[PDB]
Design an enzyme around this catalytic site. Sequence first.
Site, PDB file in Angstrom:
ATOM      1  N   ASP A  73      -3.812 -11.083 -19.576  1.00  0.00           N
ATOM      2  CA  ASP A  73      -3.213 -10.249 -18.713  1.00  0.00           C
ATOM      3  C   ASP A  73      -2.028 -10.751 -17.735  1.00  0.00           C
ATOM      4  O   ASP A  73      -2.144 -11.103 -16.556  1.00  0.00           O
ATOM      5  CB  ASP A  73      -4.120  -9.536 -17.630  1.00  0.00           C
ATOM      6  CG  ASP A  73      -3.417  -8.310 -16.836  1.00  0.00           C
ATOM      7  OD1 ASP A  73      -2.393  -7.936 -17.245  1.00  0.00           O
ATOM      8  OD2 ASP A  73      -4.294  -7.757 -16.073  1.00  0.00           O
TER       9      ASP A  73
ATOM     10  N   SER B 260      -2.310  -5.533  -7.974  1.00  0.00           N
ATOM     11  CA  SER B 260      -2.184  -5.716  -9.260  1.00  0.00           C
ATOM     12  C   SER B 260      -0.991  -6.586  -9.463  1.00  0.00           C
ATOM     13  O   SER B 260      -0.040  -6.495  -9.145  1.00  0.00           O
ATOM     14  CB  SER B 260      -1.825  -4.416  -9.968  1.00  0.00           C
ATOM     15  OG  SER B 260      -3.222  -3.812 -10.266  1.00  0.00           O
ATOM     16  N   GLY B 261      -0.999  -7.805 -10.204  1.00  0.00           N
ATOM     17  CA  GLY B 261      -0.029  -8.749 -10.640  1.00  0.00           C
ATOM     18  C   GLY B 261       0.405  -9.617  -9.527  1.00  0.00           C
ATOM     19  O   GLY B 261       1.169 -10.547  -9.891  1.00  0.00           O
TER      20      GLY B 261
ATOM     21  N   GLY C 244      -2.942  -1.691  -6.301  1.00  0.00           N
ATOM     22  CA  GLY C 244      -1.609  -2.023  -5.776  1.00  0.00           C
ATOM     23  C   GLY C 244      -1.408  -3.550  -5.608  1.00  0.00           C
ATOM     24  O   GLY C 244      -0.322  -3.872  -5.440  1.00  0.00           O
TER      25      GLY C 244
ATOM     26  N   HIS D  15      -0.715  -5.736 -17.360  1.00  0.00           N
ATOM     27  CA  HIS D  15      -1.017  -4.316 -17.090  1.00  0.00           C
ATOM     28  C   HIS D  15       0.106  -3.555 -16.025  1.00  0.00           C
ATOM     29  O   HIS D  15       0.099  -2.243 -16.022  1.00  0.00           O
ATOM     30  CB  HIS D  15      -2.522  -4.025 -16.644  1.00  0.00           C
ATOM     31  CG  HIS D  15      -2.750  -4.362 -15.278  1.00  0.00           C
ATOM     32  ND1 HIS D  15      -3.304  -5.642 -14.693  1.00  0.00           N
ATOM     33  CD2 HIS D  15      -2.540  -3.393 -14.325  1.00  0.00           C
ATOM     34  CE1 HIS D  15      -3.353  -5.603 -13.482  1.00  0.00           C
ATOM     35  NE2 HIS D  15      -3.133  -4.355 -12.964  1.00  0.00           N
TER      36      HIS D  15
HETATM   37  N1  LIG Z   1     -10.913  -6.570  -6.930  1.00  0.00           N
HETATM   38  C1  LIG Z   1     -11.502  -5.445  -7.191  1.00  0.00           C
HETATM   39  N2  LIG Z   1     -12.918  -5.558  -7.417  1.00  0.00           N
HETATM   40  N3  LIG Z   1     -10.847  -4.369  -7.620  1.00  0.00           N
HETATM   41  C2  LIG Z   1      -9.723  -4.474  -8.223  1.00  0.00           C
HETATM   42  C3  LIG Z   1      -8.904  -5.711  -8.256  1.00  0.00           C
HETATM   43  C4  LIG Z   1      -7.795  -5.632  -8.935  1.00  0.00           C
HETATM   44  C5  LIG Z   1      -7.157  -4.410  -9.348  1.00  0.00           C
HETATM   45  C6  LIG Z   1      -5.677  -4.355 -10.129  1.00  0.00           C
HETATM   46  O1  LIG Z   1      -5.492  -3.095 -10.380  1.00  0.00           O
HETATM   47  O2  LIG Z   1      -5.226  -5.179 -10.333  1.00  0.00           O
HETATM   48  C7  LIG Z   1      -7.750  -3.045  -9.078  1.00  0.00           C
HETATM   49  C8  LIG Z   1      -9.118  -3.052  -8.436  1.00  0.00           C
END
Ligand SMILES: N=C(N)Nc1ccc(C(=O)O)cc1
Length: 223
Positions: free
Chosen positions: A84, A177-178, A175, A40
């Site tokens: 992912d 993410s990844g 943020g 993603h």
């Molecule tokens: N850890 C959570 N409960 N929320 C959440 C986790 C990862 C991401 C992502 O965009 O990778 C965003 C929000």
Amino acid sequence: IVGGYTCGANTVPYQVSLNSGYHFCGGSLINSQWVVSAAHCYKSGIQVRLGEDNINVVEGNEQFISASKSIVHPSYNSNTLNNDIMLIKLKSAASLNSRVASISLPTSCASAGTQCLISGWGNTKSSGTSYPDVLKCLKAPILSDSSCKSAYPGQITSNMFCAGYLEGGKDSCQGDSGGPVVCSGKLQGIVSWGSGCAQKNKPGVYTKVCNYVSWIKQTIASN
Ligand SMILES: N=C(N)Nc1ccc(C(=O)O)cc1
Ligand SMILES: [Ca+2]
């Protein structure tokens, strides 16, 4: 990272920032030429930034290397986020040192209760919005498959695991993410998804890296 701590400059030497004019995702260095991140996080025009602490200041240990190719997992579904995971190849090999180092792939899957380190430059607020400049860290346990599935009915596949705290307060966030989930010196997870951040009974969900080691190795061997 919500409810974490300041890691310390270059203390997480496998942590990378993916930059397309600005930081947009984390990643993990797995050898001198390759980064693992979330599918993603895919976009064109990626520059990999290694050796980062403050992502807004050149502090002297950075290596900035453009991606030559990205490989999203063949079975990635962007609706369900199943599979992912994505590989990014660097145009030139990173110079490895104490502050820019690869992280080992797992040889077996980690268990519920295993303590891990999650890191990134994501939002530090569970309600508001504040983005840190320096790398943030969170120590968090892997949660049981049953508690993960109970937290997110109908959404947890065999390629996902939950890590964090059902009480909330401490979590990954937008943020991050990844980025890496590292347990006993092995990359077991990739920051993938969740419902909000640090909310009660909504822990972070992570790509189960041990399921992808064969794909990672064979992909690297031919690309
Ligand atoms: N850890 C959570 N409960 N929320 C959440 C986790 C990862 C991401 C992502 O965009 O990778 C965003 C929000
Ligand atoms: Ca920097």
